Each structure stands twice: as structure tokens, then as C-alpha cells.
Design a protein around this ligand. Structure first.
Ligand SMILES: CC(C)CC(=O)C(=O)O
Lengths: 324, 323
């Protein structure tokens, strides 16, 4: 009696979800809903179904994983699906999370369904670890760093600079700050001390390299506040070595005991494929939502409300014997 | 406001006392000791003889069992659970299933809740082993225990004839640790992951030292590890081996469909191992308090508790701040 999963959106995350479901013997992919004309997108991928027929799958989908195609509804249609299915999404706008919760909570309850919002690595796993850290060590400081990954906005920003043909940006934690955080010494970090930015640019012929470097570095709202390095490369090297699909980060709680003893907790991720990891997280949490939906849990929930036991297909006894 | 009772005043109990002070929503009702009334009125404190534990019915919300002995907890845990909600750090992994059943039976019948085996391992490390396995079902989990005392093995060596007193350390092997992190995945033998270093204060007759190295051949505890053994004086052990610091690593190295290297790591660097356990116990007491009020009964483990229950903040404050 497999868990029937439904995927909304067939972008990198939707594709990643489909893949991860193959690593989970207790799950079955029922359908992948897409806005694209599946008449063209072929026909022999039995799973593809046009988004207009989503409603027809109310009795065949236990959990719908929202992988926002890659446009507006990628922040606007959790509500529309929630009224028909139990949902799981990775809404990542931290500032608007409180509001997303309320919206999904109303719709979820009103429909007698459960909706998991803001899961993934951050929000998601990183959130859980910040929580754990400040709960276990009430006195101390939390430090989150976002490992080497691309900042889409920044790459577009770089492309706006005169003389720049193409390019990519990376935000990278500064080892100095990581070491200090990991050491027991407490401290607050300035933006400039936590992360640096590295750009790899393909210049237009001629252009003026020293000038591009300074236009990027002094760029307000993007690089001005960070130590920024600019490397010049060819289009080939960009395509070859800057796919930009990797990422990671660190969540560190530096606390002090009562007598001044230094206690440090750390959680970190090293992901060769950011999207596929987010997808794996989405899938695991689908198992939890399915379980909670059966127990009649109603409304919206975050990773903060879910016991880790629900993420596993093993029985409580098996977990206590093998992993505790 | 949450009334805490501390059972046992060893290093963990002491650590719990101080940890409670770091929590505004908590209050220490009493510290229960098994020390004879052989005292100077005590020496003054929050210390109360264990025989009076029963008098605290309906004045204590959670009894944190700080005993470091899993063997004693076998019987003591059940006794307390029949009277109060409890939280313990039963650390004998092989016997957890039994401890769980016994505490479960007892707490259920008494309408109380009993959290067993919390701390850093069992506890935090257990949670991360589960998280790793669930997130990356296709991979390998590797746990290492940073440099520090292993305690059990300290008493273990204390069984070798000729050893009066001693201490033992477990130390992760950098090579194994780095490989685990690489995401290359693989299997390590016990010997490839940790090494053991002992310091022994010997003799009962200026005993045989070559034989003392009965430690190296000791099944289970040692032998599976490259174990070094140093002989020192009681004096040396006292001033140079107060093994308080410790830590460890829990790494999940996996691959997603396609071979992409994905690595998850959780680790601890603790200057005061006992006090960290104390902090963990206290935070979990809050969750147990909350659960008890919800009518939850029976035994639970860290695996059954949502992280939100560990915080005094409101569900709204957590989403606005930490999510
Ligand atoms: C989704 C992107 C537009 C976010 C962004 O601005 C960035 O990553 O730099």
C-alpha cells in the first residue's frame, strides 16, 4: 500500500522529486502536473498530466509536492492545491513565511487537509538546527553561513556591467569567521566578515578589465558591502566549470556553560546538487505529512512541528534498536 | 514556573542545577541524594535525602534522573516513573529496548510520561543519524566520538588485575573523518575509525605491567582498536586527567539518483561534556512538561519529540525568527 505522490511543476526540483521517489520503495509517483502542452512534450511518460486536470486527481493523490514550475504560481498556487490535497512546499521567502503560514492554514483546515510549508535545507534543515541550538544552549550565539553557491540576482547584476559578456557569482563563507565561530570565543560578525563574493566573468572583446572589476566591486545593494574577487575567464570555461548547481552552508551554535566552558554545536551541508537535495528533503517530508494526514492532523505545519520519526519508513521499535 | 526535581548530584546533577538557572521558565524544587543523613545539616543546599522523594508528589513537574549509571537506572527509573514524569540519559544502547519497555509499562500505568535516553549520544546524535537516513536513504552514516573519556572503558580497565585506577580516551582518526566527509562513501573497520589511549595507575604489589596490557586484548572494549597504554601515578591522573571535554561527529554521506555527492554533518565540540548533557536534559524537560499537559503518557525518546517543544517561545515567534 504505497504512498501516492503527486508533483506540481516539472522544473529542476520537480525532476529531482521524481528521481528521489525512485529511492523510496514505499512511495509511488501518480502524476506530474505541468502547464506545458503535453501534446508536444511527447506522450510516453504516462506520468505527465496537464495542470488543468489537477482536480481530477483528488482521490488518487495522498500528497502533492509543490515544485513551482518556475514562475509566479511559484509563490501563489499552494493555496489553490491546498483546498484539494495535502501539500508540501519549500516556500523560501523567510520574511513572508508568517503570512504564507496563515494563508495555507486557513485553506488547509477549511478543506480538512494538512499543508507543510517551508521545508528544504533552508528553510528546513537549517531552521531545525538553529532551533535546536538555541534550545539546547539558551545562552550563546547562532551563526548561519551559506556555503559556496550562486546568487541568481548577482549573476544578472554582473551581466548588467559594461564590458561583461557573461558571468557567474558565488557567495562563500570566509574561513576566518567559520574558525572563530567554531572556536569557543563568542562574537557578532559584520556582514563583511562572514561571507565573501567571487565572480567569474567573460568580458566583451576589448572592454577594460580593471574597470569591470571595480564596477562589480563597488556595486551597491550587491557587492559593495562584501570583499569581492573578480576572475576573468572564457565562455568555454564558464560552461565547463560553472554549472552553478552546488551549494551548502553551516549552522553553528556557540554557547557557554555556566562556568564559562565553551560548548559548540554545528550542522552543515555539502551539496554537489542543491536541487536534488532539496528534492530528497521534500520527499522525506512527504512521508511525514502522509502519516500526519492519516492521524487526522489538520492545518498548516512547518518542519519545527514534526518529530524526526515521521521521516522514516521504519517502525518505532526498529529505530530505537538500530539508531538511538 | 516548571518545577524540576534533580535526582542525583554527581557531575550531571550539578550541571543540571546550573543549566536550570539559564532557563527563566524553570525552577529547581529540590536535589535528591542517596548520601546518608551523614551530613552537617547537609553542608547546606537544595539537597534532600532520596527517602523524601515521595513527599514531593504534586510539587514537581519533571524529575530529571542524572544518574550516570545505566545499570542503576534499570530499577531506579521505574520506581520514579511510577510517581513522576521523568527524563533520563540511559546510555547503554544495547539495553535501550528493554529500558523503554519497562519505563513505558510503568509510566503508562501511573499516567505519567517518561523520556528515556536523551543527551548527546543517545540523543542529539541519534536524531542526526535518523535525519541523515531519512533525507538520504541511499548512503552511509558514520558516527565518531571526538577526543574525550569513554567512562565505561575507564571502569572496564579497572577490572584488569593490577590496575588501581585509570582513565581511557577514544580519539577519532583524521583520515577516516576526512574520508567520511569527502562523500566518496565506504566502509570503515572499527580500527580505522578510532584509536584508544589509556593512562593506568597500577599495582597491588608493584604489579606486572607487561600483563596489565591485558587491556589491549580485552574483547569488545579494546583489541578492535589500536590501543596505547601509559602507566602513571595517582598524582598524575588527578592533576592531568580531569577528562571533562568531549565531542563527536555524525556524518551521512550519500548520493542522489545520478551519483551527485551529498554530505550531511552534525558535530559537537564540548569543553564540558557532562554540562552539555545537563543542558540537553533540561531543554527536553520542557518538552516533557508540555507533553504531559497534553495528556501524553508512556515512554518516549528524542525521536518522538518535535523540536518546537524544546523552546519556551511561541509557535509564532519561532516561525518569524528561526524558520
Ligand atoms: C531567485 C534569485 C532571484 C534570488 C537572488 O536574487 C539571488 O540569488 O541573488
Amino acid at each position: 500500500s504505497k504512498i501516492r505522490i503527486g508533483i506540481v511543476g516539472y522544473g529542476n526540483i520537480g525532476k529531482g522529486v521524481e528521481k528521489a521517489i525512485k529511492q523510496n520503495d514505499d512511495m509511488e509517483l501518480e502524476a506530474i502536473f505541468t502547464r506545458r502542452d503535453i501534446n508536444k512534450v511527447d506522450s510516453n511518460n504516462s506520468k505527465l498530466v496537464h495542470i488543468s486536470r489537477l482536480e481530477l486527481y483528488k482521490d488518487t493523490v495522498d500528497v502533492m509536492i509543490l515544485c513551482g514550475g518556475s514562475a509566479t504560481d511559484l509563490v501563489e498556487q499552494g493555496p489553490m492545491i491546498a483546498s484539494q490535497f495535502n501539500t508540501v512546499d519549500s516556500f523560501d521567502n523567510h520574511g513572508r513565511i508568517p503570512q504564507h503560514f496563515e494563508r495555507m492554514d486557513e485553506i488547509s483546515k477549511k478543506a480538512g487537509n494538512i499543508s507543510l510549508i517551508s521545508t528544504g535545507w533552508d528553510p528546513g534543515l537549517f531552521s531545525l538546527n538553529r532551533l535546536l541550538g538555541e534550545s539546547i544552549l539558551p545562552k550563546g550565539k547562532t551563526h548561519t553561513f551559506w556555503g559556496k553557491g550562486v546568487s541568481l540576482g548577482h549573476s544578472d547584476a554582473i551581466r548588467r556591467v559594461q564590458g561583461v559578456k557573461n558571468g557567474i557569482q558565488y557567495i562563500i563563507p570566509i574561513k576566518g569567521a567559520l574558525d572563530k565561530a567554531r572556536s569557543g570565543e563568542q562574537c557578532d560578525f559584520t556582514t563583511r566578515e562572514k561571507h565573501e563574493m567571487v565572480c567569474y566573468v567573460v568580458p566583451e572583446e576589448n572592454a577594460d578589465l580593471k574597470k569591470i572589476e571595480q564596477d562589480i566591486k563597488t556595486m551597491p545593494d550587491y557587492f559593495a558591502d562584501y570583499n569581492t574577487t573578480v576572475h576573468f575567464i572564457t565562455e568555454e570555461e564558464l560552461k565547463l566549470n560553472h554549472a552553478g548547481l552546488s551549494n551548502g552552508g553551516f549552522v553553528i551554535r556557540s554557547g557557554n556553560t555556566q562556568g564559562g566552558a565553551k560548548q559548540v554545536m554545528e550542522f552543515n551541508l555539502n551539496l554537489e546538487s542543491s536541487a536534488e537535495f532539496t528534492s530528497s528533503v521534500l520527499v522525506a517530508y512527504s512521508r511525514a505529512i502522509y502519516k500526519l494526514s492519516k492521524e487526522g492532523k489538520k492545518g498548516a505545519v512547518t518542519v519545527l512541528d514534526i518529530p524526526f520519526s515521521y521521516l522514516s519508513p521504519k517502525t518505532p521499535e526498529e529505530l530505537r534498536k538500530e539508531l538511538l
